[PDB]
Design a protein around this ligand. Sequence first.
Ligand SMILES: [Zn+2]
Length: 209
Amino acid sequence: ISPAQIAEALQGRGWDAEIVTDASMAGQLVDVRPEGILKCVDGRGSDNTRMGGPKMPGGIYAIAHNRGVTSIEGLKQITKEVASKGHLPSVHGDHSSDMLGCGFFKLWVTGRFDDMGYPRPQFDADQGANAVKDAGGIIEMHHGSHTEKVVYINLLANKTLEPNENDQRFIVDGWAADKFGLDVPKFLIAAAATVEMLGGPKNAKIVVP
Ligand SMILES: [Zn+2]
C-alpha cells in the first residue's frame, strides 16, 4: 500500500491526511533498537525504559486482533514471536483505569470492533497482561491524560517516533505491520477506527522515505 493509497483510504473515512517528508521530521525520528518495546500508539508519557520500539494499537494486541487470535495461548505465541523477531513485546495499562487504561484493548474487549468483523478476545485485560508477562513480555503503565493532537503514520522501515507527553500525538508504525505479515490495509483501517472511537483527531500525517 502506497502513501497516496493510505491517505486516500483515510480521507474515505472522513479524515484529513497529508503526506510529509522524513526530513520534515528530522530531530524526531529514531532508529529502532531490538531492546525497545513494541508498544501502543498512545501519546502519553509512561514508565517505559525501553525506547526505540515500534508503535501499534494496543502494543502486541494489534497483531492478535489483525489475525483474529483471541485465546490466551495464541497471545503467548505472538509474544514469543515478537520477542524472537527483534522487539520486546508489550501491552499496557495506566494509573487511571489500571489495565483498562489501553483504549485499543478496551474497545476490543467491549466489542466496538464487532461490526468490522473482529472476534472478541477470550480474556479480560488483567488476564491478557498476565499472559504477556508470563510469556516474557513487558507490561507498560502510562500516566496522565490523553491530549493527542495528530496521528503520524510512519512508513520509514526500522524507524519510529517517540511519545511527547507535552505535545501529544498518536504514532502508528505502518511498516511494522508488513514485518509481521499482517493484512496492512486492514491494520491501518483498525488503527483509524481506534482513533475515531477514542474521540481522537481524524488528522493524519504520513511520513515517507
Ligand atoms: Zn493503548
